[PDB]
RNA sequence: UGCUAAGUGGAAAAGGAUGUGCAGUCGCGAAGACAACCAGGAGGUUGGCUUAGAAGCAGCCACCCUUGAAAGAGUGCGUAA
């Protein structure tokens, strides 16, 4: 998982969601899974 | 060796004269050997019925060179209308080698070559440093100066120890180390050297190594040289770095051996030995690295093109094309290896390849 | 069903054909002798072919006309096209010599009329820096 | 890096940072531009970094204009010294920027690449800015 | 620098009206 | 598609039925472009095999007396304009559809009255 | 060109100044001035939303028909005061006109087309000065760049104008300058 | 009369972001718009150059024509190709 102040949808299959008061990017490719922190 | 410096050698066409000999103008009973070898090669070319143009293109290349110091070899390769290869060699060959044929002979150049990759040599003391960058023909020099002047801590501190030059000198030394590290990191990012020799003392060589990032600290070899006021000459630096470069070039052969053994053991098909399928792979163009063994007097029968080769015409007739000429293996196989831009590795009697040849492929 | 471009005057070479159908279970020795015999009419022009295979690891192939890019090169005499088209133009071609490529390619074109089919070949022309008068 | 060939007075007061721009607030040469939104000093080391980010993103085509030039100098006095005893020597050159001023311009055939090429240059300046065009 | 920040920040009370002595 | 382009398309399609003696409605879901291009050459001698939107064609049907054919315009839609003769299409469609099995006729038209799928193929038997 | 004027409602300003114009703009109106050949200034107020609506679809040189206390007047938009940051309309100078009166108007030019692939199209003059009667100002004059290659200059003298429209700006202004496409070795040499 | 879900109120930047409320422009849409499911997504052709290899998909230039309901000298994944 990547934890940076800035999260962006790296590829075209990425999605930006919001869980438990946090911005997250979830993708089929596990490399693109990242969260804001 | 890469396949870039000899790439344009493929473009040239015509008879090729290749001479490897000893060029050591050291003592008084050594200059005579130079023109003795010159007469020998002249008479060999006369006996082989060489065109005059080769000889009148060679005498000036032989005679117009500033004599190299110590014991060094010499390598020449020409076509007659121009010179192509002309360098010095680390060690003189045991036998003077003269060849005159359409395919150039470059096997002795694979290992014996006074040509090392780019590298950095830095002399450091905790008042500054000086750096030399080597990229082959050109040498660049830089003098890094320091901003903390009093790098010496006197015994005196003050009245009852009030005031003390401990921290205010450590900070100066750290400033100097940071400046040197930043400059060296800039050089590493720009030129991408392979080795960064650092010569200093126990104190101002292990604290600069702890300042450098992991990028450069992995490629640092620590020296043991003297003070910076004495200064160094080119011969001394060459002798200092030769011991490290020997081991560095040995490690590449070791790694190639490991790759060859692994690919042979798995039997996947990325390794080939013996002329039978090495020639086929070289013809197919998927040869990545060529390992030259003791081919000796083995011959290869190349077809119509200057590149296509086969072990014998019996299996060459499966291509339909008929035989055109016969050439020596250690003279034509490296040519095709250069043609497809493959790397050339000279065995050190530790691979033991079948038929004295080997190849690391690119795919099935 | 695979595709491949083999020059007419070559049978059983190593690079182009060997690895190509060497993984589809198709015998390589019997195809090359048949292909060479059938293609011996051109003998100087590369002509493609499609290997229509059956599950029994047999081959049945129908030959094709030499490619349009290669055909238009000899009509101008230049061995290769423009590296930078629309700025450097290698040679000249008039509307007359285009029509023969239309006829030779008539069996491999989806066009209906010689007028429409002529524009298809003209499209390939400017893609390689060849002027059409 | 841009340096004036000569200036009369080499040590000058700090430029005032008050008010909005009185002129040069519209695109005149290109099709797209960057409009400042707050005051700052823009050094010549950030102008050169901003116009290389534009060049690399568009590669070959297009033209770049720079409407601000670093005339005014700023002086820094030697490190690790007390206060007084003269004034420092000039060290870097700046350009007084006020909100509304147009800094860079660009004329490129399409929109996406031209608009994204300007966004790369904005991330190199110490201010906030926006992309503007020639329309009303 | 927490002590300095806190001391100046309390000038923004309603009873101080944006000013305090010693900033 | 744009609103204006939809208006433009109906004008061409409306005239295509007036000048055509009859028409045949089919569906093409499952025919490759090579399969279709085969039909544009087998039937291209005398017939034209065009397709368009359902509702957009439905507007063109209001200009003629085929108001009972609106049931067949739902689903994948194909319309064939037979400018010359009827036997030419009545048998070339039958053999092509049988070969591919993915081309099922929906109906037909003649003399102001539609003819069902069973009775549209028997015209070739005349 | 035949233009239909746009009807607007204008109200006479009770007050003037900076403390009364700020109230007007905070409410939704814009101060205006209706001067002209009649030697008769008037300080008016136009609705901000309504005034900007016609400008969005009729260019800057719109033809207005102001209804000042029940009458009808024909006016022309002379100048506009626009805030650099907020992009507001802080003022509007209106000029009284009559039908058949020749007015010098600066209209805009739009370049359209696609020239040679290895060329770059640059526009120098954004607008040109044009003389026309009050009801026939073209809202835009277009120039076509097609088949134009390398060094070429579409000077202001080649721009076609509708019949009944003169040209005040001299034919020496350079409007469009089409040149060779700059290479990658030329982008680095500029601005340094 | 409305807003906030953060204990924001009761500290802070460049920047990231389908939090929510108010107002204003423009596109698309019963001629069926967006999402979803079903079927095509082609022929010249592996466009030309470079390259050992470069076939839509290291890199450079161009970016056409045809059958057509549409099909880009090709939006990604993938192969040495």
Curated annotation (Swiss-Prot), chain A:
Q: Name one Pfam family in it.
A: Ribosomal_L36
Q: Which GO terms describe its biological process?
A: translation
* Protein name in UniProt: Large ribosomal subunit protein bL36
The highest taxon in the source lineage is Bacteria
Q: Write down the NCBIfam families for this protein, in alphabetical order.
A: rpmJ_bact (TIGR01022)
Question: Which GO MF term does the entry hold, naming one?
Answer: structural constituent of ribosome
Instruction: Please verify whether the record's keywords include Metal-binding.
Output: no
Where is it found, in Gene Ontology cellular component terms?
A: cytoplasm; ribonucleoprotein complex; ribosome
Q: Which UniProt keywords apply?
A: Ribonucleoprotein, Ribosomal protein
Family to which this protein belongs: Belongs to the bacterial ribosomal protein bL36 family.
Curated annotation (Swiss-Prot), chain B:
Explain the induction of this protein: Induced by anaerobisis (at protein level). A member of the dormancy regulon. Induced in response to reduced oxygen tension (hypoxia), low levels of nitric oxide (NO) and carbon monoxide (CO). It is hoped that this regulon will give insight into the latent, or dormant phase of infection.
Q: Which UniProt keywords apply?
A: Coiled coil
Its Gene Ontology cellular component terms are:
cytosol; peptidoglycan-based cell wall; plasma membrane
Q: Per the database entry, which stretches of residues form a coiled coil?
A: 39-66
Which branch of life, at top level? Bacteria
**In its UniProt record, which GO terms are filed under biological process?**
response to hypoxia
Q: Which Gene3D superfamilies match?
A: 3.30.1330.30
Protein name per Swiss-Prot or TrEMBL = Uncharacterized protein Rv2629
Record the organism.
Mycobacterium tuberculosis (strain ATCC 25618 / H37Rv)
Curated annotation (Swiss-Prot), chain C:
Q: Which GO terms describe its cellular component?
A: cytosolic large ribosomal subunit
Gene Ontology annotations of biological process type: translation
Keywords for the protein's UniProt record, in alphabetical order: Isopeptide bond, Methylation, Ribonucleoprotein, Ribosomal protein, RNA-binding, rRNA-binding, Ubl conjugation
Recorded GO MF terms: large ribosomal subunit rRNA binding; structural constituent of ribosome
Keyword Ribonucleoprotein tagged: yes
Cross-link for Isoglutamyl lysine isopeptide (Lys-Gln) (interchain with Q-Cter in protein Pup), residue positions: 92
Q: Does the keyword RNA-binding apply?
A: yes
Q: How is it modified after translation?
A: One or more lysine residues are methylated.
NCBIfam families referenced in this protein's UniProt entry, alphabetically: L11_bact
The record's comment on protein family reads:
Belongs to the universal ribosomal protein uL11 family.
The free-text function statement in the UniProt record for this protein reads: Forms part of the ribosomal stalk which helps the ribosome interact with GTP-bound translation factors.
What quaternary structure, including any partners, is listed in this protein's UniProt entry? Part of the ribosomal stalk of the 50S ribosomal subunit. Interacts with L10 and the large rRNA to form the base of the stalk. L10 forms an elongated spine to which L12 dimers bind in a sequential fashion forming a multimeric L10(L12)X complex.
* Name recorded for this polypeptide: Large ribosomal subunit protein uL11
What is the gene called? rplK
From Swiss-Prot, chain D:
For this UniProt record, give its keywords in alphabetical order, as a comma-separated list: Ribonucleoprotein, Ribosomal protein, RNA-binding, rRNA-binding, tRNA-binding
Q: So where does this one cross the membrane? A: none
A single GO BP: translation
User: Does the keyword section mention Ribonucleoprotein?
Assistant: yes
Segments carrying the region annotation (Disordered) are 1-24
The GO molecular function terms of this record are:
rRNA binding; structural constituent of ribosome; tRNA binding
Specify residue ranges for compositional bias: Basic residues.
1-13
Q: Which Gene3D superfamilies does the record cross-reference, listed alphabetically?
A: Ribosomal protein L10e/L16
Q: What cellular component GO annotations does this protein have?
A: cytosolic large ribosomal subunit
Highest taxon of the lineage: Bacteria
Functional summary from the UniProt entry: Binds 23S rRNA and is also seen to make contacts with the A and possibly P site tRNAs.
Record note on quaternary structure = Part of the 50S ribosomal subunit.
**What HAMAP family does the record tag this protein with?**
Ribosomal_uL16 (MF_01342)
Record-stated family: Belongs to the universal ribosomal protein uL16 family.
Name listed for the protein in its UniProt record: Large ribosomal subunit protein uL16
Q: Which organism is it from?
A: Mycolicibacterium smegmatis (strain ATCC 700084 / mc(2)155)
Question: Lineage in the entry?
Answer: Bacteria, Bacillati, Actinomycetota, Actinomycetes, Mycobacteriales
């Amino acid at each position: 998982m990547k934890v940076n102040p800035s999260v962006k949808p790296i590829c075209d299959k990425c999605r930006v969601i919001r869980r438990h008061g946090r911005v997250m990017v979830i993708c089929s490719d596990p490399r693109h899974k990242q969260r804001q922190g | 060796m890469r396949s870039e410096r000899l790439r344009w050698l493929v473009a040239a066409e015509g008879p090729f004269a290749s001479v490897y000999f000893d060029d050591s103008h050291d003592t008084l009973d050594a200059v005579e050997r130079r023109e003795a070898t010159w007469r020998d090669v002249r008479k060999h070319l006369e006996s082989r019925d060489a065109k005059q143009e080769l000889i009148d293109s060679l005498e000036e290349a032989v005679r117009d060179s500033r004599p190299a110091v110590g014991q060094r070899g010499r390598a020449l390769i020409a076509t007659g209308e121009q010179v192509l290869v002309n360098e010095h060699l680390i060690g003189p060959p045991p036998a003077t080698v003269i060849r005159l044929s359409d395919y150039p002979y470059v096997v002795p150049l694979i290992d014996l070559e006074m040509r090392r990759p780019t590298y950095v040599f830095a002399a450091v003391d905790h008042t500054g440093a000086d750096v030399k960058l080597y990229q082959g023909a050109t040498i660049s020099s830089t003098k890094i100066d320091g901003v903390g002047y009093p790098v010496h801590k006197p015994v005196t501190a003050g009245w009852n120890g009030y005031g003390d030059f401990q921290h205010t000198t450590e900070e100066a030394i750290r400033m100097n180390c940071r400046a040197v590290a930043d400059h060296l990191t800039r050089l590493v990012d720009a030129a991408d050297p392979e080795v960064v020799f650092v010569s200093g003392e126990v104190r101002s060589r292990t604290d600069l190594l702890s300042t450098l990032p992991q990028r450069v600290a992995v490629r640092v070899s620590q020296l043991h040289a003297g003070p910076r006021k004495s200064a160094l000459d080119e011969e001394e630096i060459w002798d200092l770095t030769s011991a490290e470069f020997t081991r560095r070039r040995y490690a590449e052969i070791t790694n190639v051996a490991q790759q060859f053994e692994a690919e042979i053991g798995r039997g996947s098909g990325l390794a080939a030995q013996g002329l039978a399928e090495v020639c086929a792979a070289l013809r197919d163009g998927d040869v990545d690295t060529l390992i030259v063994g003791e081919l000796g007097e083995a011959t290869v029968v190349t077809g119509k093109a200057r590149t296509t080769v086969a072990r014998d015409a019996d299996m060459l007739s499966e291509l339909g094309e008929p035989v055109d000429r016969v050439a020596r293996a250690d003279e034509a196989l490296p040519f095709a290896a250069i043609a497809v831009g493959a790397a050339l590795v000279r065995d050190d009697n530790r691979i033991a390849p079948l038929d004295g040849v080997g190849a690391l492929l690119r795919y099935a | 069903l695979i595709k491949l471009q083999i020059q007419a005057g070559q049978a059983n070479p190593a690079p182009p054909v060997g690895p190509a159908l060497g993984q589809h279970g198709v015998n390589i020795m019997e195809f090359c002798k048949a292909y060479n015999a059938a293609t011996e009419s051109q003998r100087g022009n590369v002509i493609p072919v499609e290997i229509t295979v059956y599950e029994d690891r047999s081959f049945t192939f129908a030959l094709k006309t030499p490619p349009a890019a290669k055909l238009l090169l000899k009509a101008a005499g230049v061995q290769k096209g423009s590296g930078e088209p629309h700025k450097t133009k290698v040679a000249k071609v008039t509307w007359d010599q285009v029509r023969e490529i239309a006829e030779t390619k008539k069996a491999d074109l989806n066009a209906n009329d010689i007028d429409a089919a002529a524009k298809i070949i003209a499209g390939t022309a400017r893609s390689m820096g060849i002027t059409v008068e | 890096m841009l340096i004036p060939r000569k200036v009369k007075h080499r040590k000058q007061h700090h430029p005032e940072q008050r008010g909005i721009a009185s002129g040069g607030t519209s695109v005149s040469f290109g099709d797209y531009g960057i409009q400042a939104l707050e005051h700052a000093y823009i050094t010549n080391r950030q102008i050169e970094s901003a116009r290389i980010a534009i060049n690399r993103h568009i590669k070959r085509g297009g033209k770049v204009w720079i409407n601000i030039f670093p005339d005014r100098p700023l002086t820094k006095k030697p490190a690790e010294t007390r206060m007084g005893s003269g004034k420092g020597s000039p060290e870097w050159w700046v350009a007084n920027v006020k909100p509304g001023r147009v800094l860079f311009e660009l004329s490129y055939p399409d929109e996406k690449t031209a608009r994204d090429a300007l966004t790369r240059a904005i991330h190199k300046l110490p201010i906030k800015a926006r992309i503007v065009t020639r329309e009303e | 620098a927490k002590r300095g920040r806190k001391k100046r920040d309390r000038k923004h009370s309603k009873a101080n009206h944006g000013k305090r002595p010693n900033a | 598609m744009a609103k204006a382009d939809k208006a433009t398309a109906v004008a061409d399609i409306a005239e295509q039925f007036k000048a055509s003696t009859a028409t045949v409605v089919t569906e093409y879901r499952g025919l490759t472009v090579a399969n279709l291009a085969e039909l544009r050459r087998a039937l291209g001698d005398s017939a034209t095999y065009t397709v368009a939107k359902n509702t957009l064609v439905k507007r063109a049907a209001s200009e003629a007396g085929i108001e009972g054919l609106d049931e067949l315009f739902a689903g994948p839609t194909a319309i064939a304009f037979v400018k010359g003769e009827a036997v030419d299409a009545a048998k070339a469609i039958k053999k092509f559809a049988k070969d591919n099995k993915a081309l099922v006729i929906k109906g037909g038209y003649m003399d102001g009255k539609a003819l069902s799928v069973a009775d549209v193929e028997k015209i070739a038997d005349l | 060109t035949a233009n239909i004027p746009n009807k607007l409602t204008a109200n006479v300003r009770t007050r003037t100044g900076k403390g009364a114009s700020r109230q007007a703009r905070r409410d939704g109106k814009v101060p205006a001035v209706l001067y002209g050949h009649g030697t008769d200034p008037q300080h008016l107020e136009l609705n901000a939303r309504d005034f900007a609506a016609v400008l969005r679809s009729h260019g800057t040189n719109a033809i207005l028909t102001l209804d000042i206390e029940g009458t009808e007047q024909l006016a022309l938009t002379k100048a506009l005061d626009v805030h650099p940051i907020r992009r507001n309309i802080q003022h509007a100078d209106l000029l009284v006109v009559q039908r058949g009166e020749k007015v010098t108007v600066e209209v805009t030019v739009l370049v359209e087309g696609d020239a040679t692939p290895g060329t770059l199209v640059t526009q120098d003059a954004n607008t040109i000065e044009i003389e026309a009667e009050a009801l026939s100002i073209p809202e835009q004059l277009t120039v076509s760049v097609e088949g134009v290659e390398a060094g070429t200059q579409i000077t202001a003298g080649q721009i076609s104008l509708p019949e009944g429209v003169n040209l005040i700006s001299d034919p020496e202004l350079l409007v469009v300058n089409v040149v060779e496409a700059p290479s990658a070795e030329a982008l680095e040499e500029e601005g340094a």
